[PDB]
Amino acid sequence: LKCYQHGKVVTCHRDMKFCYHNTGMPFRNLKLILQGCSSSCSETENNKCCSTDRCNK
Amino acid sequence: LKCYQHGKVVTCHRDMKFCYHNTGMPFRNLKLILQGCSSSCSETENNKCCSTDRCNK
Amino acid sequence: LKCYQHGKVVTCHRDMKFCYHNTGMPFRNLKLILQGCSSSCSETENNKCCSTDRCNK
Amino acid sequence: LKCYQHGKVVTCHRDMKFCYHNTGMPFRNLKLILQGCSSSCSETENNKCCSTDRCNK
């Protein structure tokens, strides 16, 4: 599995079967972009995970 | 002063005479972007601040 | 003004008349803590700012 | 596997064989605490991962 990771395509570790994309906004000026290989999403996070190469945006 | 703040334009409080845009990566899969109104940046990152409306593109 | 900034005490720039301590959790496994000198907080989070040395414990 | 997750002990998903602890400091006022279940650490992150219940701090 290969996933996008902030301008790089990285190869996932054998135990990372998913690519992931999510964003966070904890403070008015602060945005977080979580992008990369990952393990399984939460139930709440169901669509933040994808299983195909380079699928994470 | 007005500044960009993650897709919107916000009006700054009186004591905030700067627009800021700083981009970090504290972990490989996590990017952080500070964008909004601000007080003065430090000298080391002096250019991270600008002082005109919508300057922090 | 002096404020706590993640285990240290820093002197604030002239235009920063507040100490701030805000704690967020944009993802379940990720906590974010803002602690340092600051300009004025918003009304909605008015109490997140204080105005005396080392007030932002 | 059970790991600490910001004041909670959570049960890891079958594909999360590790607990994880790390911190990030991308900006002078900003500290990040990454704590929870995880998949395998990077090579650079070798000691941020642990394999026993509640081992992540």
From Swiss-Prot, chains A, B, C, D:
Keyword Electron transport in the entry? The reply is no
GO CC terms, sorted:
extracellular region
Q: Which residues does the annotation list for site: Important residue for inhibition of rat ASIC1a?
A: 27-28, 33-34
Which residues are marked as site: Key residue for inhibition of rat ASIC1a, probably binds to rat ASIC1a F-350? 32
List the subcellular locations. Secreted
Disulfide bond positions? 3-19, 12-37, 41-49, 50-55
| Protein name as catalogued | Mambalgin-1
Q: Which residues of the full protein are shown?
A: 22 to 78 of 78
